[PDB]
Structures are given as C-alpha cells and as structure tokens.
Amino acid sequence: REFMAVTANNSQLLTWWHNTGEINTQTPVADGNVRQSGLYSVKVQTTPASSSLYYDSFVYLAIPGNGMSDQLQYTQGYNQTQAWTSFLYSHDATVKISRNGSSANSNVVIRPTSLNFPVRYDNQSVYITVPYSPTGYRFSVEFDDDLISLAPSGARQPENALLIFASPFENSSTKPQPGSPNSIAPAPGRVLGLNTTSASTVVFNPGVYYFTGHDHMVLSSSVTWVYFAPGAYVKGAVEFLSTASEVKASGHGVLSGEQYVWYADPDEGYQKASGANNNGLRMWRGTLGNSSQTFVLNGVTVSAPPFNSMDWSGNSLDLITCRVDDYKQVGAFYGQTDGLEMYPGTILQDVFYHTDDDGLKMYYSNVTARNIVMWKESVAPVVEFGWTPRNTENVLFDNVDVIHQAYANAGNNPGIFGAVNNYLYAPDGLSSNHSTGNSNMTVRNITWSNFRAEGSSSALFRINPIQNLDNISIKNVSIESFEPLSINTTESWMPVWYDLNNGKQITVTDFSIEGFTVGNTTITASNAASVGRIDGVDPAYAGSVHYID
C-alpha cells in the first residue's frame, strides 16, 4: 500500500502526526492544515538501536511573516526558518534525522554543545542518542552545510533550523484523566463558545483547531485548565477570565499565533494596533481579582507570537505568580516577541526561548529560573531589568545557554545582562540622559550563574542603574567569541545615574564577576577592560565592580 506515517504510543515513547500537513514556505496554510517541514524528516526509536521500527515524529515549520508577505517588514529581514518536533519519552531514544535523497552528507553540531549526545552518520541520515532525563531536553541540530552568515554580525547560524523537544510523560497534574469532571472537548476546526462555557477544563485532543486571525481563545471565568494534548495543534491565543486560585495551561500540543498580524489589537478587530499602544495580542493573558492566583504553564509549545508572549491584567501584579516547566517558544520572527513575565515567587525551568526582544525579564522579586536554552535574535538583552526603576530582590537565574545571537548595532540594546533606559523618556531604550532614575529603589541580591553564550556574542553587560544596585553576582559566564568591534554591541558599560527629582546619585554596591571567560581566555581584573571588553564602567562605580579571581 502507499506509504503512511507510523507513530508510537506506548509507555516508553509517544510521537504524533497530522494528516493535514502542508508543505508551504511562502503563504498561509489552510485553516485546518499544519505547516510541515519539507526539508527535515524525523523518526524516533527507543533504544537499543536495532532493525526494529522507527516511529515518525511530525516536524512543524514556522516562517517569518507566517506566510503574510506584507508582514515581513515587521521582522528582522533575514531568510531563516525554524522547524521543530516534539515527542514524549521515558527511556533513552535514538532520533533519526533525514534530509532528501539529494542532500549531501554533512556533519551536525548540537546546541547546547554541553549535551554531548552520541551522534552517528549512516545511510544519508543522522542518528542522535538522546538519554532520558525527567526534565527532558530542548536542542538545536545544525547542519554544517546549512550554515549562513548573518550580516552585519557575521554570526554563523542554520538557515533552516531544526529543534528537538524531548519531554517526559504527562502526570495526572498536567493531563486530564479519562472523562474528567465538568470538562469540554471541542471538535477539530473552528472553536466557538469557550468564552461562555460553564466547563472547568477545556481539552484539545489530537487534531487541528483554529480561531481565526480575528478572534482568540477567551476562556470563561469558570475555566481553570486548558489542555493541549500531544498531537493537538491550536491556532489562537489564550486569555483566562478566571480569577481563581489557579489557572493552568498544560500538555505538549502547540498553541500558534500564526493567523494574527503583528501587533494584532483584540479591541480593534485584530488589526495592527495604532500608535504602538501596547495592546498587541498576548499568547498568554489572565486577569486578577482581589485574591492570589498561580499560573501553571507546563509542556506547551507556543509558536509565532504576534506580540509579547505574556502579560496579566491587574492593579497589583504581586497577586500573581508563575510555575513554568518544559515550555517552548518557537518561530518568533516578529519584533517585541518577549519571553514570559516571571511574577513574584515564580519558578521557571527547562524552557526554550526563540525571541526577538526582552528575553528573561527580571522585573519581580523571589524569582528562580533555571535550565534555559535561548536563541536570541537581533533586539534587546538576554536578561532585562531596565525600562522602569523597581524594588526587586532575591533572584536566581542559573544554567542559561544562549545558543545564538544576531545583533546589528548599539540601537538594538544588545547584551547578555542589560538594563535599558527609562521607557517614559526613552521609549526605544537608548539615551544619553541618565538623570531619570529613582534613588529610593533598589535591586538587591541577584545571582546570574552558569550562563553560556555560544558562537559570537554581544557585551557581557550594558546596565543603566535606573535605581540602586546592591549585591549582584555573576558566577560562571562563558562567551565563545565576540561580535565585531565595529558594530558597537560588545563593549560592556554602566554609566553613572541620577535621581529624576532630587539629583541624588544612584549607587552600585558589590557587583561581582567570577568565572568569566572569553573563548579560551580567563578574564580577570587585569584583562577585563581589554579582552573582556568591559571598558564602560563609570569611574564612580569602578570601585564597586569586583573581579573574584
């Protein structure tokens, strides 16, 4: 009979397919179709490797503009595409990646490179042995012959990326059990009525679902759980109306904003928002009442966000906290596609971020984020804590691997650790005016540890102390190489700042750097300014920056 995809669904492996897959790299796919990679084929086999059957794993594809050529102007203008595949596993598995029969043999580089998974080449394919880890893995498979240079940084990156998301099975807390109480499971196609349903749980089983580019998934106040099953592909954006103690989005399916134009405004017919009014549609949105709420986000893959990925509505955001795990953001070629907000008390871990704006937004206290892979594009710092002065304390970001960066100039506000200017007076984040800070606020006890920048990188830090800084520690940061000196994105700086109202000088105390390396060179106080390119620390703060050697 004609060849058909064969998927796995057992206790050791789960893969899926879509019968409405569409090979298309230039226009929007049909409402009920799923854009599929025409370059990469992926199959998976639980070890040990044998003549046993390999199971097909659907490879999704995201393209800049999502097929809407008139939206390309809102991207960085590169020609990169991003494909990805997800599967669940509970045992080591071999991932077999194939390219068409006419593709020549090419070695691959897996990022993060620290993974060091066994890789073998045979019969026009690449076999990667992925070990089972309870927190799974999110990595990039880069073919040497597919690498291109991105001007003007010269960054070497895949023209056609391929991401692999191997995740653990879903427990009873992230997967609705059979015939769950007061649940509703919409049929494939156009999804209607969820904004007025009396259901508590919304279940999206395998299949394709879509709102349209002129509607989104507004969930009624009774909905506290939306589940995206592995194999479910939902074109839309989520907004909880529930003010309950917990609102949850889980499952390993996909939530794609590909049908929305950039900056789509939900209050203006979903047309592009007028005058950068900040009302672009978020992929995750909630609204608070007068009681605490926890947003649990687990397993989901968000693709093609039309604007910032997430923001909650409310007068006091101290009432919201997040619990994020095994989550991915892909195909974010548009600008202002920020990572999630990490509200007070947040624990975020095992995440993959493809973003063209603020990545890790350190705006709230008592936050812990760890095990993150980031494909930074061309705008904003990897870590951001500028824009507005804040009282923020007790933050820990650990094990963050920025596998790629493609900045172009100083105006992009580049840098691993950054704090741009005051948005009220410098909306684009860059200005020589350093007198709009707040001397009554302080960012204290911050730890950024085990950060790694693969390939060419922007500056270690470009921080405007818009409020006082105290006890900020950088421990173990490796930069493979720096972007060209010429583009002004690699020199680190920290200019002296003053209070907006009384002119008091903003203070910086105990800002330490330990375990900083550039390529094969260890950075110390001796070569920090030269090899480390840390030549912009204001003399008033120089005595507060300590190199622990």
Ligand X SMILES: OC[C@H]1O[C@H](O[C@H]2[C@H](O)[C@@H](O)[C@@H](OC[C@H]3O[C@@H](O)[C@H](O)[C@@H](O)[C@@H]3O)O[C@@H]2CO)[C@H](O)[C@@H](O)[C@@H]1O
So which residues are the catalytic ones?
338, 357
Would you say 142 or 358 has its CB closer to ligand X?
358
Exactly one of 125, 279, 449, 517 binds ligand NAG (CB under 6 A); that residue is 449
Distances (CA, A) of 452 to 139, 213, 404, 432: 14, 38, 10, 30
How far apart are CB 536 and ligand NAG at their closest, in Å?
A: 9
Whether the CB-CB separation of 89 and 12 falls below 8 Å is answered with: yes
Exactly one of 40, 55, 74, 211 binds ligand X (CB under 6 A); that residue is 74
Residue 43 structure tokens: 């199959």
Would you say 76 or 438 has its CB closer to ligand X?
76
CB within 8 A of 122, min separation 6: which ones?
none
Binding flags for ligand X, 341-360, as an x/- string (CB under 6 A): ----------------xx--
Measured CA to CA, the distance from residue 416 to residue 383 in angstroms comes to 6
Residue 12 interacts with, from ligand X, ligand NAG, none (CB under 5-8 Å by kind): none
- E-assigned strands of 4-131? 13-14, 21-23, 34-36, 41-46, 55-57, 60-62, 81-89, 93-98, 108-111, 119-122, 125-130
Exactly one of 335, 345, 437, 465 binds ligand X (CB under 6 A); that residue is 335
Q: For residues 370-429, which are near ligand X according to CB under 6 A?
A: 379-380, 411-413, 427-429
Whether the CB-CB separation of 301 and 254 falls below 8 Å is answered with: yes
Residue 102 interacts with, from ligand NAG, ligand X, none (CB under 5-8 Å by kind): ligand NAG
Which region among 24-32, 297-305, 309-317, 512-520 touches ligand NAG (by CB under 6 A)? Answer: 512-520
Phi, psi angle pair for 541, to nearest 5°: -110, -15
Q: For residues 331-390, which are near ligand NAG according to CB under 6 A?
A: 344-345, 365-366
CB within 8 A of 350, min separation 6: which ones?
135, 136, 138, 325, 326, 327, 370, 371, 372
Would you say 208 or 374 has its CB closer to ligand X?
374
Count of residues for the chain?
A: 549
Measured CA to CA, the distance from residue 118 to residue 131 in angstroms comes to 9
Would you say 355 or 478 has its CB closer to ligand NAG?
478
Residue 266 interacts with, from ligand X, ligand NAG, none (CB under 5-8 Å by kind): none
Would you say 348 or 382 has its CB closer to ligand X?
382
Measured CA to CA, the distance from residue 507 to residue 377 in angstroms comes to 32
Which region among 117-125, 242-250, 350-358, 442-450 touches ligand NAG (by CB under 6 A)? Answer: 442-450
Q: Taking CA 455 as the corner, what is the angle to CA 452 and CA 460, rounded to the nearest 5 degrees?
A: 50
CB within 8 A of 532, min separation 6: which ones?
460, 492, 516, 518, 523
Residue 380 interacts with, from ligand X, ligand NAG, none (CB under 5-8 Å by kind): ligand X
Exactly one of 19, 52, 105, 501 binds ligand NAG (CB under 6 A); that residue is 501
User: Which residues would be at the binding site for ligand NAG (CB under 6 A)?
Assistant: 7, 9, 16, 39, 79, 99-100, 102-103, 148-150, 159, 192, 195-196, 205-206, 215, 218, 230-231, 290, 318, 344-345, 365-366, 394, 396, 410, 425, 430, 433, 435-436, 438-440, 445, 447, 449-450, 475-476, 488, 499-502, 515, 519-520
